[PDB]
Each structure stands twice: as structure tokens, then as C-alpha cells.
Design a protein around this ligand. Structure first.
Ligand SMILES: [Zn+2]
Ligand SMILES: [Zn+2]
Lengths: 105, 56, 122, 119
């Protein structure tokens, strides 16, 4: 579009930044795109905020183990995500509202 | 001699305490350095001097 | 144990393989000290250009410029999680993380002259 | 001392006197920032230091086997369980005063029978 321009963060879209263990990501790659690559689900538990990640049964044969997430602060920093398409257009997609680390299990 | 060895052991024994006594005195900050010497330098001098007085 | 409680769990679409910018989702990070505010009438415009490659970010002239440099990697990696209107989450791997990386400015008509004065010092 | 930085630059602050209202400020030499001073003290030398004596007193201090123990009753919790060391300020002059760290209340007491401390 306008060349060399950046796109639209003004919309204030929020996204989460999550640190994942290398092994888990490796597993995720396995999921088929055709499937839509549903890796598993995220659980939000109350009685305090607890968030965990569990792999889909298809991913591994065993009992799915929950991976606890440690919520973290934004830190004194502003993190924004920008994307570059094949077209090489650049867009300012969203701001990182929350940070989290998925612990290995 | 058997008793000379008892007498020697008890010479070192008393010097060993005399040293602990100056150490306890130095740890309690009551030690008063000799003009032109560290509080520590002054202490080590005493320790070294007692221990030699003893060996002799 | 038994779950007397309720959990809200969302399906996670492990990263869709085919995305237009599947290839590039990047992180642009600014230090809080820089005090960059995206909601600025001034910062309405913004251009991002590769410097020939650090990225160069610039607003309209008269505004600060930032340089973006790439951070080192690790065993763990970051994914961007976005949520669809339907609760489902889609995750995308971060291609690269850049620390920006801007100007000041007040660096014109100086630098080279100051060093020279400094030399007039020794 | 304890000095501040410029919000906006993060660059350090240089003192400027406001000749008119007879007051001290802190200017930034990279931008147009100025802020009034908290204290009148700008520079402190300190030749006869005491900062270094009780350094590296991590709560894990008890986990050092190299450290010696004593049956001295604590001024706070009265516990006869404590590790001890000498002034960690690695100077020649330095006194052989001992610092005892409680294996319960974590309070630092000394053997100094000349003076009374709080560090
Ligand atoms: Zn400044
Ligand atoms: Zn105590």
C-alpha cells in the first residue's frame, strides 16, 4: 500500500507474548496445518488466576501433562508486534498486553 | 623426662591461652595499637612473640 | 482432584501453517525510558525501512528516529498468542525480536566538532 | 549521595543553581529537562569508610560450611545459633571486630566493646 509505511496499532489490539520451551514448540510443528494444527488447549482457572497449557491427546500418547504458566509483568518496556507479509507490507498488529512463560513439565 | 614432658606440654598450654586472651581482647576492639602500627600488626607481633617465648 | 470449580479452556490452534504473514511476526520493543507513545497525533504516521539490516523507524520529520537491532536467540522461543472473537487462540512464532533503536536527536552540527574540540584537548 | 537521572533521556543529571530564587536544580545536558533537588548535599567523599563491613550477607549465609559458629545469645531472638566473620572491608588498618549473623532472626550483632552499631 503506501510503500515503506507502517500499519494500524491505533486500534489498540491486544495480544499475549508467551515463552515456550523448545521441546514443546517442536511438538507443535508436528500438528498438521490441514488439521488447523490444533495443538491443545489453554486453561484459565480461577480461585486465583492460573493458566496452563495442555497438549492434545493426538500429539502424544499418554496422559496430557499440564504446563503451568508464570504470569509476568510488561516490564519497563513497550512491546509491539509488527508483521511482514510476503507482499512485504508492514503492519503494526497489536501491543503486548500480557507476558507469560510456559514452564516445562 | 616423663615429668619434663608434662611441664613442656603445660608451658605450650598456658601460652596457647595467653594468645586466645589477646585474640578475644582484639575481637572485642579493646586492643590499643603501638604508635606507628596497625591494630592487627600490633596483635600479630604479640601472638608471634608469645609463641616464641614458649618454644624457647 | 475433583473439579468443584470451573475452568475456561480455549482451544489453541497450534500455529496455523499457512498464513500470509505466517512467515513474519516480529517483536518491536521499546525501552520505557524512550517514552514512545503510539497515541500521538504526531505519531500518526510512521515508516519502517531497512537500512542498507537494522530497521529504521521514523515519524514525520522533526520527530525521533529509532534503529532496530536483532537480539540473540535461546532454547526457548516466543510465540504470539492472539484470540479470535470466538475464544480460540491462534499462535504464531516470533520470527525475530528487535530492540529499538531510535534517535534523540539534537545530534546535528556536532559530534565531529565536539571530538575535535576534545582533541584541541589531549 | 543517591543521584537521579533524566526521565525522557535516562542520561545523568548535572547540578544548576537558580540564581534568582536561590535554589538547587538538576539539569539534563542531552535534553531541556530540569528538576529541583531533594537534598542540599551534592558530593560526599568518605575517607574513613564503614561500608563494606557487612557485605554479601545473603540469607543463605548459614549454608557456607567454611564459616565458623558460636553459642552467643542473640540481642533480638536470644538464639545461641550464629555464623561469624570479620570486617569484609579489605583494608590494612581494619579492626578484628566480629560480626555475628543469627541462624533464625538474621540480625547482625557485633563483639565491639568500645562502640554500639545498627548494621
Ligand atoms: Zn534528558
Ligand atoms: Zn536472633
Amino acid at each position: 500500500e503506501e510503500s515503506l509505511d507502517l500499519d494500524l496499532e491505533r486500534s489498540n489490539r491486544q495480544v499475549w507474548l508467551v515463552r515456550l520451551p523448545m521441546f514443546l514448540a517442536e511438538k507443535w510443528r508436528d500438528r498438521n496445518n490441514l488439521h488447523g494444527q490444533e495443538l491443545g488447549k489453554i486453561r484459565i482457572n480461577k480461585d486465583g488466576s492460573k493458566i496452563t497449557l495442555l497438549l492434545n491427546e493426538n500429539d502424544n500418547d499418554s496422559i496430557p501433562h499440564e504446563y503451568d504458566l508464570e504470569l509476568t509483568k510488561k516490564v519497563v518496556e513497550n512491546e509491539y508486534v509488527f508483521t511482514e507479509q510476503n507482499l512485504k507490507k508492514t503492519a503494526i498488529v497489536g501491543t503486548v498486553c500480557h507476558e507469560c512463560q510456559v514452564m516445562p513439565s | 623426662d616423663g615429668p619434663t614432658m608434662r611441664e613442656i606440654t603445660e608451658t605450650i598450654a598456658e601460652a596457647k591461652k595467653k594468645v586466645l586472651d589477646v585474640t578475644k581482647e582484639a575481637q572485642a576492639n579493646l586492643l590499643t595499637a603501638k604508635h606507628g602500627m596497625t591494630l592487627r600488626e600490633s596483635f600479630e607481633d604479640n601472638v608471634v612473640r608469645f609463641l616464641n617465648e614458649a618454644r624457647d | 482432584d475433583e473439579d468443584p470449580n470451573e475452568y475456561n479452556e480455549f482451544p489453541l490452534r497450534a500455529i496455523p501453517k499457512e498464513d500470509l504473514e505466517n512467515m513474519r511476526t516480529h517483536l518491536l520493543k521499546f525501552q520505557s525510558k524512550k517514552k514512545i507513545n503510539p497515541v500521538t497525533d504526531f505519531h500518526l504516521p510512521v515508516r519502517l525501512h531497512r537500512k542498507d539490516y537494522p530497521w529504521v523507524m521514523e515519524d514525520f520529520d522533526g520527530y525521533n528516529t529509532w534503529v532496530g537491532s536483532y537480539e540473540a536467540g535461546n532454547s526457548d522461543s516466543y510465540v504470539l498468542l492472539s484470540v479470535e472473537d470466538d475464544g480460540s487462540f491462534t499462535m504464531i512464532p516470533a520470527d525475530k525480536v528487535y530492540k529499538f533503536t531510535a534517535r534523540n536527536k539534537y545530534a546535528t552540527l556536532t559530534i565531529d566538532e565536539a571530538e575535535k574540540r576534545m582533541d584541541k584537548k589531549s | 549521595t543517591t543521584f537521579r537521572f533524566c526521565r525522557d533521556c535516562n542520561n545523568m543529571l548535572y547540578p544548576r543553581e537558580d540564581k534568582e530564587n536561590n535554589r538547587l536544580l538538576f539539569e539534563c545536558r542531552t535534553c531541556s529537562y530540569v528538576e529541583e533537588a531533594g537534598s542540599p548535599l551534592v558530593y560526599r567523599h568518605e575517607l574513613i569508610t564503614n561500608i563494606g563491613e557487612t557485605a554479601g550477607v545473603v540469607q543463605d549465609i548459614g549454608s557456607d560450611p567454611t564459616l565458623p559458629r558460636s553459642d552467643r545469645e542473640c540481642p533480638k531472638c536470644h538464639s545461641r545459633e550464629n555464623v561469624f566473620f570479620q570486617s569484609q572491608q579489605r583494608r590494612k588498618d581494619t579492626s578484628m571486630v566480629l560480626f555475628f549473623v543469627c541462624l533464625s532472626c538474621s540480625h547482625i550483632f557485633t563483639s565491639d566493646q568500645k562502640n554500639k552499631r545498627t548494621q
